[PDB]
Amino acid sequence: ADTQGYKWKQLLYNNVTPGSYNPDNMISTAFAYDAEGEKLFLAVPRKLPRVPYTLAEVDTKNSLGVKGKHSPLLNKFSGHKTGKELTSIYQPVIDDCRRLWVVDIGSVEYRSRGAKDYPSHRPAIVAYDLKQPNYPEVVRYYFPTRLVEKPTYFGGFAVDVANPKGDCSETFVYITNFLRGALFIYDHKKQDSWNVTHPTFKAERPTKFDYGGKEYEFKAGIFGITLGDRDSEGNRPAYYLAGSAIKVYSVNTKELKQKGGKLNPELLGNRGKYNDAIALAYDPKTKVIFFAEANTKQVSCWNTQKMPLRMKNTDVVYTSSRFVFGTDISVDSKGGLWFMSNGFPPIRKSEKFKYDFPRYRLMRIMDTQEAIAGTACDMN
């Protein structure tokens, strides 16, 4: 229930000329913590002008849990020279083999004001090897033009490593898209990809979001994807959710890896009213799924072994009046539970939402057992 972590009023960069960018325009949408390396990676998409590094890192060795060091400066990704090696990213994910995966969407989202400095190209899935220094690029796959479908609306993704003890090449990537209610599926082995749509990937009712005493609204599809326990053949449930929704589905990875196959998603089925979340994370050690919620100022949980999913089977692991718009959640290598808010929901002009407390908030609960103790997500 204790947390350690970081808080920023503004995301400032180390070794970047002061004044050559506006620190309020640096908006982080996602993170990934490498527990073995004591490294934190932050996605800062090039949504607004003058973002020096779209993949940014901080060394948490000094800082984490140390009084006075709550706002580390962002650094260039150690695997990069200039900052132009990735154009714009929304989400970093670390797999079972300590490969750092990002999805370069391939263009910036503003016009003029230095946009020429970041020339466009086709969306790419890119991976860096954290095991080797200093983080060499080991995967670079471009989307075939036939499959591009609004890359700016890519949400969470999952990296499915069939052979975590081999060369780690039998690997699937499922990337959510919250506009199209779509999953883009990438077969790393075959070097092939395809898009899949399902009525299940779509928004239910619009999500309600309170800012500055008013009620705003957004309508997002799938956002929204995490991987469960493998069976002896290497298939697993892939849990997903739409942002604007309270229902949770799973679909087997078996049906996902089959290009042109029918999908048979199972309802699970719902978390109760107004608990919309855009991010969810499955923990292998407790079998709990954690939700970083949009408007409730909370992080919630559901043990996957308690069926069916009703509200009565969920609880709260974190509450903070300052946790405005949960935007990312993952569990790390040493079973750390990380969750992030940034007061940046998918609503027109949300970049200019301002708060009396630090906008960017990243917390860790030391382990998932610590989290769920004395709660309906326990055992028992």
Ligand SMILES: NCCc1c[nH]c2ccc(O)cc12
């Ligand atoms: N808080 C930023 C909203 C957002 C837009 N796209 C995203 C992708 C991943 C994510 O965690 C969040 C987002």
